[PDB]
Design a protein around this motif. Structure first.
Motif, mmCIF file in Angstrom:
data_model
loop_
_atom_site.group_PDB
_atom_site.id
_atom_site.type_symbol
_atom_site.label_atom_id
_atom_site.label_comp_id
_atom_site.label_asym_id
_atom_site.label_seq_id
_atom_site.Cartn_x
_atom_site.Cartn_y
_atom_site.Cartn_z
ATOM 1 N N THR A 182 0.923 -1.234 -0.043
ATOM 2 C CA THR A 182 0.081 -0.071 0.025
ATOM 3 C C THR A 182 0.843 1.253 0.004
ATOM 4 N N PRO A 183 0.267 2.332 -0.494
ATOM 5 C CA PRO A 183 1.358 3.656 -0.648
ATOM 6 C C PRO A 183 1.372 4.246 0.723
ATOM 7 N N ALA A 184 0.560 3.855 1.501
ATOM 8 C CA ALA A 184 1.014 4.499 3.041
ATOM 9 C C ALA A 184 2.117 3.690 3.682
ATOM 10 N N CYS A 185 2.170 2.512 3.463
ATOM 11 C CA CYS A 185 3.134 1.405 4.052
ATOM 12 C C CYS A 185 4.464 1.846 3.237
ATOM 13 N N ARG A 186 4.459 1.903 1.964
ATOM 14 C CA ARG A 186 5.468 2.278 0.978
ATOM 15 C C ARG A 186 6.084 3.495 1.641
ATOM 16 N N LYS A 187 5.338 4.541 1.881
ATOM 17 C CA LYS A 187 5.762 5.876 2.607
ATOM 18 C C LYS A 187 6.609 5.824 3.682
ATOM 19 N N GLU A 193 5.869 6.136 18.342
ATOM 20 C CA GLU A 193 4.886 6.466 17.297
ATOM 21 C C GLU A 193 5.507 5.880 15.864
ATOM 22 N N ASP A 194 6.821 6.402 15.778
ATOM 23 C CA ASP A 194 7.237 6.074 14.513
ATOM 24 C C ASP A 194 7.052 4.428 13.976
ATOM 25 N N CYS A 195 7.544 3.679 15.128
ATOM 26 C CA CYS A 195 7.204 2.137 14.708
ATOM 27 C C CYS A 195 5.754 1.889 14.663
ATOM 28 N N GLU A 196 4.984 2.395 15.482
ATOM 29 C CA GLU A 196 3.388 2.056 15.496
ATOM 30 C C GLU A 196 2.668 2.375 14.406
ATOM 31 N N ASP A 197 3.034 3.737 13.949
ATOM 32 C CA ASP A 197 2.501 4.235 12.612
ATOM 33 C C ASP A 197 2.845 3.610 11.478
ATOM 34 N N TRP A 198 4.472 3.161 11.366
ATOM 35 C CA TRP A 198 4.977 2.014 10.391
ATOM 36 C C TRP A 198 4.452 0.786 10.162
ATOM 37 N N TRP A 199 3.933 0.498 11.519
ATOM 38 C CA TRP A 199 3.458 -0.978 11.767
ATOM 39 C C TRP A 199 1.951 -1.011 11.299
ATOM 40 N N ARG A 200 1.253 0.103 11.542
ATOM 41 C CA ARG A 200 -0.222 0.222 11.439
ATOM 42 C C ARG A 200 -0.374 0.290 9.877
ATOM 43 N N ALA A 201 0.432 1.155 9.166
ATOM 44 C CA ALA A 201 0.097 1.496 7.774
ATOM 45 C C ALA A 201 0.373 0.188 7.118
ATOM 46 N N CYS A 202 1.359 -0.792 7.497
ATOM 47 C CA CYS A 202 1.813 -1.746 6.915
ATOM 48 C C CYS A 202 1.208 -3.262 7.210
ATOM 49 N N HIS A 203 0.211 -2.850 7.945
ATOM 50 C CA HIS A 203 -0.842 -4.179 8.685
ATOM 51 C C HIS A 203 -1.382 -4.845 7.865
ATOM 52 N N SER A 204 -2.003 -4.363 6.718
ATOM 53 C CA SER A 204 -2.601 -5.197 5.662
ATOM 54 C C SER A 204 -1.642 -5.866 4.582
ATOM 55 N N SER A 205 -0.245 -5.277 4.365
ATOM 56 C CA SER A 205 0.480 -5.774 3.483
ATOM 57 C C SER A 205 1.038 -7.353 3.784
ATOM 58 N N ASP A 217 7.332 -3.329 17.828
ATOM 59 C CA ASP A 217 8.551 -3.484 18.259
ATOM 60 C C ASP A 217 9.317 -4.486 17.248
ATOM 61 N N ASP A 218 8.654 -5.575 16.979
ATOM 62 C CA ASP A 218 9.277 -6.569 15.903
ATOM 63 C C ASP A 218 9.643 -6.127 14.758
ATOM 64 N N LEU A 219 8.735 -5.147 14.181
ATOM 65 C CA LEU A 219 8.897 -4.652 12.711
ATOM 66 C C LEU A 219 10.287 -3.656 13.023
ATOM 67 N N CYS A 220 10.108 -2.702 14.039
ATOM 68 C CA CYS A 220 11.296 -1.660 13.828
ATOM 69 C C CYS A 220 12.624 -2.283 13.812
ATOM 70 N N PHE A 225 17.552 -0.505 13.541
ATOM 71 C CA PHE A 225 16.718 0.305 14.588
ATOM 72 C C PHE A 225 16.646 -0.433 15.821
ATOM 73 N N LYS A 226 16.396 0.254 16.972
ATOM 74 C CA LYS A 226 15.912 -0.431 18.070
ATOM 75 C C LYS A 226 14.662 0.026 18.429
ATOM 76 N N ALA A 227 13.693 -0.664 18.812
ATOM 77 C CA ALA A 227 12.256 -0.318 19.297
ATOM 78 C C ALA A 227 12.324 0.450 20.599
ATOM 79 N N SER A 228 12.545 1.662 20.744
ATOM 80 C CA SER A 228 12.877 2.617 21.848
ATOM 81 C C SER A 228 11.420 2.550 22.947
ATOM 82 N N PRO A 229 11.353 2.259 24.043
ATOM 83 C CA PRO A 229 10.489 2.277 24.952
ATOM 84 C C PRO A 229 9.735 3.541 24.954
#
Ligand SMILES: *[C@@H]1O[C@H](CO)[C@@H](O[C@@H]2O[C@H](CO)[C@@H](O)[C@H](O)[C@H]2NC(C)=O)[C@H](O)[C@H]1NC(C)=O
Length: 197
Positions: free
Chosen positions: A60-65, A105-117, A146-149, A157-161
Motif C-alpha cells: 500500500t502507498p501508506a506502507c511504502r511511504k 509513534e514512528d514504529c507504531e505508525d509504520w506497523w499500522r500502515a503496513c498491517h494489511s500488506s 517493536d518486532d517490525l522496527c 533500529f531499536k524499538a525505543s520504549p
C-alpha cells in the motif's frame, strides 16, 4: 559534532542539500545523502542499498511511504553517530548503524500502515522474494511494532520504549518546516544516556 557513516553511498561529512526528493526533504538543512540517493530511496524496488523490498502482493502507498521515510532517515540523518559500528570489525571503511532507538509513534505508525500488506521475510537486510518462501501477512512476521522496527533491517533500529518529545528516542521522519528533533537526542545519547545514567 555530527558525522556520516562510511559507505559507498553516504557523503563524507554532513552538509546542506539544495534539493532532496520529497520524503527525504526534512534533512535538507544537514544531510548525509546526495540528491541521487534520495531519488533512489523512493523506488519501489531500490537497488542502491543493502535493504531490499521483500514484500509480495501489493504494498500500500501508506506502507511504502514509511519504508521510504526509514530509508531517507538511514541515508540522510547526520545524527546517527553514537550508533555507528563497523560492518566488519575491525575496520571502519564500511560502516553501519545498530540499535538506533526509534520512538514508539514512528514504529507504531509504520506497523499500522503496513498491517494489511504481505511480506516474505522478517529480516530484509541483504533482491526479490523467492518462490519457495511463502507470502505471509505483515502482522505474522511482525506481531508488534517493536518486532517490525527491530527485525526489518537486522537490528538497524531499536524499538525505543520512549515516545516522541521524550528526548530519549529518534523520529525516522519529521515535518521539514520543523527543526530537527533528533539533533539533541543523538547528543543526549553521545553524552552517556542509558550507559552511564
Ligand atoms: C539478516 O538476518 C537474516 C535472518 O537472520 C539473514 O538471512 C539469512 O541469510 C543467511 C545467508 O546469508 C542464511 O542463513 C539464510 O539465507 C537467511 N536465513 C533466514 C532465516 O532468513 C540475513 O543474511 C541477515 N542480513 C544481514 C546483513 O546480516
Amino acid at each position: 559534532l555530527s558525522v556520516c557513516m562510511n559507505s559507498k553511498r553516504h557523503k563524507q561529512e554532513p552538509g546542506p542539500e539544495d534539493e532532496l526528493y520529497q520524503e527525504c526533504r526534512p534533512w535538507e538543512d544537514n544531510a548525509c545523502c546526495t540528491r541521487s540517493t534520495s531519488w533512489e530511496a523512493h523506488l519501489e524496488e531500490p537497488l542502491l542499498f543493502d535493504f531490499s523490498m521483500m514484500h509480495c502482493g501489493l504494498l500500500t502507498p501508506a506502507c511504502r511511504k514509511h519504508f521510504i521515510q526509514a530509508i531517507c532517515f538511514h541515508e540522510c540523518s547526520p545524527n546517527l553517530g553514537p550508533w555507528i559500528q563497523p560492518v566488519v570489525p575491525n575496520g571502519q571503511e564500511e560502516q553501519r548503524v545498530w540499535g538506533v532507538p526509534l520512538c514508539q509513534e514512528d514504529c507504531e505508525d509504520w506497523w499500522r500502515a503496513c498491517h494489511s500488506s504481505l511480506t516474505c521475510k522478517s529480516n530484509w537486510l541483504h533482491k526479490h522474494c523467492p518462490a519457495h518462501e511463502p507470502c505471509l501477512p505483515f502482522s505474522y512476521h511482525f506481531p508488534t511494532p517493536d518486532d517490525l522496527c527491530e527485525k526489518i533491517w537486522n537490528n538497524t533500529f531499536k524499538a525505543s520504549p520512549e515516545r516522541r518529545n521524550s528526548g530519549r528516542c529518534l523520529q525516522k521522519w519529521f515535518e521539514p518546516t520543523l527543526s530537527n528533533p533528533n539533533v539533541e537526542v543523538a547528543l543526549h545519547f553521545a553524552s552517556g544516556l542509558e550507559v552511564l545514567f
